[model samples]
Target chain A: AIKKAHIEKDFIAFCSSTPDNVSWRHPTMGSVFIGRLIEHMQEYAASADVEEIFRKVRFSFEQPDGRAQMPTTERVTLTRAFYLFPGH
Target chain B: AIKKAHIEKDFIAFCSSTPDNVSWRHPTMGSVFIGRLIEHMQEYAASADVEEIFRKVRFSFEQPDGRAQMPTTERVTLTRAFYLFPGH
Candidate 1:
């Protein structure tokens, strides 16, 4: 999957078939690697719902902070972009 | 920014802007983190040129292996897909 490819290098384990599915360690950890990715994107497009974030990661995080009417001077930096949390 | 966000949870540093660019570990390491990603994409799309990979990460690595005429049954497993090399 695109998620798999995007995080390939960090991947620590893989079934290639599925089950617990694959696992990754670097660039985040566990599913948080992918989960936080989507979460951060949603923040960029605050109006963007969960499904939307799942459908595809936006082009940038400046998105939410750069909307025409409202702008959060503090854009989501690369470091702050993916908010990591515990996962399996 | 999508690139940065996709790797956010794994992100370790950020300039917010660019120059040496931000830094990240785990997920991969250095530019190899992103470089290998695009390379793998190109392997999938085949016809998909470099610019295309640079523009976006595909939904799956099965692309290159599953073209209509030829398919690599092995596929690009998550573990081997993101080949890391030295980088700044």
Candidate 2:
């Protein structure tokens, strides 16, 4: 019963709200997911440009079924650290 | 002259002090290196056992020459977080 409610409400909400096409970094940065290449801006671009870049990033569905690839623990942290310390 | 000094002092010191064989997690936890399998204890073992586990970890040389592979930004952080949060 609950599952059916989720499918009726949440699933429909997601289908309506989520973008038709999206892109994102792969689980381990092995590659990127470009469901749809919305834009490719240069580095140090304006905030709006960066926001657009972010919008183009999404999850991949290369694996079996529609499940997205998951990243390991180390990959997520190390990448975040690099972004945090841009000067270094 | 400085290069020669490095080879004589630092290199030789490394050759003498460093272990003959070592193992470590790869740059992204894609795989682990086991230069010489020292031990493989069960999980939640004693601190000494854990120490032994740490001792067996080292960097990989699968890329080129003897240069150790480096970790990316995200990989390092995620792995560290996992280790930190035992309860979570």
Candidate 3:
């Protein structure tokens, strides 16, 4: 799946709160995934010695499992919540 | 100013294409600030191998300035561009 495939250093954030995450369940605002990606890059670029930080360094991580997060019987409120992307 | 005040490791990506970056000029969608933050955490958590990646690590940065950037009149097409957060 898309979630399992994109776990790299140069990662972009994908919010499940959007249609892309859930798919046909509610496919209204799908553009959120791309928007969030740009936001992440802009944020990383603006923070600190960005010019130096972006020197293409590879950390230790192989085949991260985003879809395999532990599932609990009870759903708890995430500290922060927001809507999925809305495309008109 | 908000830009220069906060400079920590837990940084949230902000897309200038949003009103929060440019501000009041296009004050339609403003909730994007919170949404992007959540997406960033989800990404950082998903891309790494161990849980320690999120265990509070301070890299380095000092009074990063977000408002101050090189002013160039030339408008070039950015390969990736997304809209700011919206609050209706």
Which candidate gets the maximum lDDT versus the true structure? 1
Q: In every candidate, how many clashes are there?
A: 9, 19, 7
TM-score of chain A of 3: 0.22
1 or 2, which is superior by DockQ? 2
Clashing pairs in 3: A29-A85, B18-B84, B29-B85, B29-B86, B29-B87, B30-B87, B32-B85
Q: What residue runs in model 2 are displaced by over 4 Å at the alpha carbon?
A: A1-88, B1-65, B72-88
DockQ of each: 0.04, 0.07, 0.02
Error of 1 at B19 (Å): 2.6
Which one wins by lDDT: 1 or 3?
A: 1
Q: What's the true lDDT of residue B22 in model 2?
A: 34
lDDT of 1 at B52: 30
- Tell me the RMSD of model 3 versus the true structure: 21.9
For every candidate, how close is chain A to the native chain A in TM-score?
A: 0.27, 0.21, 0.22
**Worst 10 contiguous positions by lDDT, candidate 3 chain B:** B69-78
For candidate 1, the TM-score is 0.18
Ordering by TM-score: 1, 3, 2
Residue lDDT tens for model 3, A1-88: 3222111111122222211223112257444333433454455544422211221111101112332111011111112222233331
Model 1: per-residue Cα lDDT over A1-88, one tens digit each: 3422221221112121123233333444454335545465646455543222322332222223221111111111111122233331
* DockQ-superior candidate, 1 or 3: 1
Report, to 2 decimal places, the DockQ of model 1: 0.04
